[PDB]
Amino acid sequence: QYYMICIPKVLDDSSDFWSVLVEGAQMAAKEYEIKLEFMAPEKEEDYLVQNELIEEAIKRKPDVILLAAADYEKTYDAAKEIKDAGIKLIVIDSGMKQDIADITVATDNIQAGIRIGAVTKNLVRKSGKIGVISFVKNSKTAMDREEGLKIGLSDDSNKIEAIYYCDSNYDKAYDGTVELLTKYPDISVMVGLNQYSATGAARAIKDMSLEAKVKLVCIDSSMEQEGIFEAMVVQKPFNIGYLGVEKALKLLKKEYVPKQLDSGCALITKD
Template sequence: MEVDTVYALEVRLMLELWWKLEFLYQVRRIATMRNTKKLITWMIWLLAFILIVFLLTRCNAKDNKTVKIVYVSKVLDDNNAFWFSLIEGTEIAAKEYGVELTILAPDSESDYEKQNDMIANAIALKPDAILLSPADNEKTLPAAKKIKEAGIKLILIDSQMAEPIEDALIATDNIEAGKKVGQLVNHLIKENSKIAVVSHVQGTSTAIAREVGLRIALGEDEKRIVDVVFSDSEYDKAYQVTKELLQVHPDVDIIAGLNEYSAIGAARAVRDLKLTDSIKLIGFDSSVEEIQLLESGVFDGIVVQKAFNMGYIGLETAIKILRGEEVATNIDSGSNIVRKDDIYTEENQKLLFPFR
């Protein structure tokens, strides 16, 4: 039992004992009274006292009710810095606010069917709110609608859905993040450059928005994109599709990875093919391996999301909604460009290593 709950119970028992003793005392006094007017007055005061004590004990019990929140993530992967940091943000916020937090997640970002099952499991737990990072902006929608039908608050983290049914969205502005990838690519373009994109899960709002942002930033150079392939957010698949891509398009000299799995898988393939001198890479997110690849020059730059902030603000927003407070319904958690020559600035050190 929580310490606060035990304390609340003790206070309630003391109050109940107090008013019972007071009741007996007042009854004894009333019994000795002969004046009818005084008798009625004392009875009114006594009833008012009993009512106040009753309301206080009820309010005290209500205020100490433990808030229950379930977070249904896209994946639970301690090796992925983005998801590790995001989940850490929700957990730390839960501790600070005294919330009971349950985390559910499939083994793969692309497994929307498993995630839909977990959404059903989350609803069955009857929480006060559900945080959700939808695996697919359309295929997750029917399951997410059931959250709202159950009268449960819905806060989206990282990704949005085809219909705005949520109470709030906390995510990177992925079009802006895609534009930042495009800015990095623009600095690398030569006269005959060919660009390839290694994205993550086809159909997700993040993949769509980042590619849109990239193309906007490239402007007329968008026509240099020769192919877009998808890794399904798996390192090995990203590695394989990059190798296959380079067999079909051997003249590609710039590759942009649009999430951590895609960027690292592509970089491993380029490194193993000994093409790091002829192919420039842009990464996304900030795992230890990705930072090492940036330091060694395999990546020319990376775009880093503020994953910890996303998770923390997501849970904090849920609490505010449950309290009836006004909140922003669309919160951009932000992203930054990091290059090799500015890894060690104070700002980027906090961004890349938030737990130091």
């Protein structure tokens, strides 16, 4: 039996992204008779702890490590040792700047923020400014989302008043939302770039009694996730996990696999 170790950014499971990704990879391991362990820090942003867990992963002598890189530049400090241990690397969800993945399975994050940027441009057509709640500034999925966002806003990208980084923590999302809507009464659209961010913004907007003054759009977990959002981009975490496993299989079989697979996402809109 093949031995694979999955290293998400967290195993939260109030998280509907991380929860379903795990289900998809455990369904693939089931379907293919794979031995699969999970190892993850307690927080998304704890790359130092994620690096320790990769080192630990490597000493377990798995055939494959699947890795959602906590940090676009610093994860490599530990993941650079994976190849040379004779282990296959699949990157799932969130890449590195360094080109070491054997395969990457992710959403197109740039196009996700672009489609939510374009919804937001239409909302502030006449007026309004924009507040953003991001998550972990240095993860590649945050970067691609915020870049996308600004691209889809075109000329209107100067309407972003501020960007707050909650580091994937629901109470920081809430606080930073309160701080922004206090400081910029001209914000008529809030953007949350992941579920933590969006959820904390929607509560804060609720507690502030702003729900018919400030609209909320987000990039979100999955087709599971709810209203007084008025648009959301939904990913396919089940497929990210499923495919990461399945196609790790091709590599070990010495068989052709693309170096990048696009997991796909959809925009839903309240009308």
